[PDB]
Design a protein around this ligand. Structure first.
Ligand code: CA
Length: 178
């Protein structure tokens, strides 16, 4: 297993987690903070609990040595969390950035859908190929995904909440270099 290319580094803008939308007290920066919690002791998660869109995406914008970088990516791990109000999504798509425009760091990374940004244009994303995924997503553990290697500035997981929940929830994601 190679270097972790999603974790935050102190004093570095990148890698940066981003989301289309978030419950504000559950910012997406929680997903790459190296804290993993499946409960409220402490609560540590991104969610879109009680937000208006049942679909949201969470992703990582890569960096090398403090500045933007493409990386070669073939994996994603996601620790779903669940309580009465949130849980694993009922459906998802994992996507990678293909825009010709070099992405900027979002001004408000937990709420990318509320600003003009390349990430909001579906032409700038393609789905990963030959996905290997769990047969069912499970809260309470790191759920591992693998796919054909791509060279990209960003990947994201775009997810629709379960019908019996008020949102989707993630305590941590991890992406590794080869
Ligand atoms: Ca975390």
């Amino acid at each position: 297993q190679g270097a972790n290319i999603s974790d935050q580094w102190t004093g570095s803008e990148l890698p940066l987690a981003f989301a289309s939308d978030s419950n504000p007290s559950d910012p997406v920066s929680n997903v790459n903070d190296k804290l993993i919690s499946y409960n409220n002791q402490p609560a540590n998660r991104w969610t879109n609990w009680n937000r208006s869109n049942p679909e949201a995406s969470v992703g990582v914008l890569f960096g090398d040595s403090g500045i933007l970088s493409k990386r070669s990516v073939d994996n994603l791990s996601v620790g779903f969390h669940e309580d009465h109000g949130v849980g694993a999504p009922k459906s998802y798509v994992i996507e990678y950035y293909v825009g010709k425009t070099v992405p900027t760091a979002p001004k408000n990374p937990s709420f990318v859908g509320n600003e003009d940004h390349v990430f909001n244009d579906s032409a700038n994303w393609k789905p990963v190929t030959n996905l290997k995924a769990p047969a069912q997503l499970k809260a309470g553990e790191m759920n591992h995904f693998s796919f054909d290697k791509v060279e990209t500035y960003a990947i994201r997981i775009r997810m629709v909440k379960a019908d019996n929940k008020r949102g989707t929830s993630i305590t941590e994601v991890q992406i590794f270099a080869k």
